C-alpha cells in the first residue's frame, strides 16, 4: 503493497526562517490521497498541522493557520508544508500521513437516512409513495477524521547553534580477549551537532547483530554515539550527518 | 494534549488492561474517535478508527468502545510488544481539524529479568594520534532498565569525565545504555588497566582492558 510516505527537508533551521518539508507518496493503487501533517515535540503530545485533500482543499490547526501553507504537485506525488517564522518551540519530529476526512449526515433516534424506502429527505419515517407522506427532520453534520498510514518522521531542530560534522573512530573489542570465538566491532561517532546521524554497516548488507545506541550530550555541548556489530569480509560503518552534508565510510580492522 | 488520558497504566503479561480518553460533547462526544500506538524508535501505527473499527492488520486483542464523552481502548493478553505510548484523537469542529489525547505509557509487568551484556572498547589509534582517548562501555539486553556504571583504573574509582546515558528501551522491550570515559592519551598509557563495572539488580559485570595489550 500500500502507500509509503517519505518526509524530506532540512534537519536544522535558524530561528525566523521558513521551514519547508516535502512528503513523497509511492505505491498507492489510487490517483491521489488526502495527505496531512502532524508533529511531536520532545516530551509533548502529537499536534495536528493541516491537510490537503484530493480536491486541493486545505484545512489547518486554527492555532497555526497564519503560519502554515500546504501545496501539492500531483505530477510528482508530493505534498509540501511551509511554516513561517519558526522558533525553537517548532523543534519536533514532523510526520506526513494519509488522512480520512468525511462529513456524515446524523439523524436523531428512530429516524432512517438513505433512499431505501423517501430519497429526497435527510431523516425520515413512514409511521409512502412520495416524500410529503413521511415524518422528517434535518440532519446534523458529524465530522470524521483519522490518519490511515504514517510516514517515518523527520527530526527538525530550530536553533542558532553551529553544525559540527562528526569524527568517526573505528572500535575493536579484540585486545579484551584475543581468543574470543566472535569479534565485536564498532564505530564511535564523536562530537557532532545537531542530531541526527544515520549509521549502517557494509552499506546495509550487514543488518543482523547491529546495535546503534542513543546519543549522549557530552560536556563539550556536542553529541556522541556508538554503533557495534558482533561477527564470528571487510567491515565498514557508513555514517551520514545530513545537517553538515557529510558521509563517512570508516574501515574497521577485525584479531 | 487536549483529550484527557492517564499518563501511566500497568498490567501483567497475558492480562487485560484499559486506557480511557476523556473529551467534551464537541470532540469525543461526537464519536469517530481514533487510537494510535507509538513503540519507541518507531513510526506511529493506527489501531482504531470510528470508535470501534480495528485498522488493517491490527490483531483482535485490541478493541475499543465509546460511552458519551469517554472512549476506552482495551488490550487483552498483554504482551511485552504492547509496551508503547497510546494516543486517542478526534475531529474538533471540522473533519480537517484534530485534537490528540495527552498520551498513556503502558508498562507490562512480570517480564523476565535479563542481565546486561557489556562490551568495553579501548581508544582507536586514530583518536590517540590526536592526544585524546575515549573509552566506550556498551550495555545491552538488560531488563529491567536500571543500571549503575562505575569506572576503575588500577583499583581507583574514576568519577571525573564519565558520561553515562539514560537507559532507553530497545524494540525487544529490553534496555540499552552507554558510558564514555574521556581521557588524554597520557592518562590512557599511564595505567595498567581500566575497567567498566556494570551493576544490575545487585549483580556486577566487569570488563577490563590493558593499555599494554591495546596500544
Numbering used by the authors:
A (entry chain H): 28 to 144, 151 to 160, 165 to 269, 275 to 296, 298
B (entry chain L): 30 to 244
Extract from the study:
Here, the current status of the fully automated ambient-temperature beamline VMXi at Diamond Light Source is described, and a highly efficient pipeline from protein sample to final multi-crystal data analysis and structure determination is shown. The VMXi beamline and its associated PXF within the Research Complex at Harwell offer a highly automated pipeline where researchers provide a suitable protein sample that is used for robotic crystallization, monitoring and subsequent in situ data collection from crystals in crystallization plates or in thin-film sample delivery systems. Here we present illustrative examples of data measured using VMXi from a variety of proteins comprising both conventional crystallographic standards and ‘real world’ user samples. Routine RT data collection provides a useful capability that is highly relevant to studying protein dynamics and ligand binding without the complication of cryo-cooling.
For AbD08, a bovine naïve ultralong antibody (i.e. arising from a sorted B cell originating from an animal receiving only a typical course of veterinary vaccines), sparse matrix screening yielded >10 crystallization hits, and the VMXi screening capability was useful to provide fast feedback on diffraction and crystal quality without the user having to go through the lengthy and challenging process of harvesting many crystals. In this case, we were able to rapidly identify promising conditions and collect a complete dataset to 2.2 Å resolution with 96% completeness from four crystals [see Fig. 2(b) and Table 2]. As done previously, a cryo-structure was also collected (in this case at beamline I04 at Diamond Light Source) that yielded a 1.59 Å dataset. MR placed one monomer in the ASU and full structural solution was possible thereafter, despite a 3.5% difference in lattice volume. In the cryogenic structure, an extensive network of hydrogen bonds involving both protein and water molecules was resolved surrounding this loop (and the greater Fab monomer). The significance of these differences between the two structures is not immediately clear in this case, but may be a consequence of an inherent difference in stability of this loop at both temperatures, thus hinting as a potential link to its biological role.
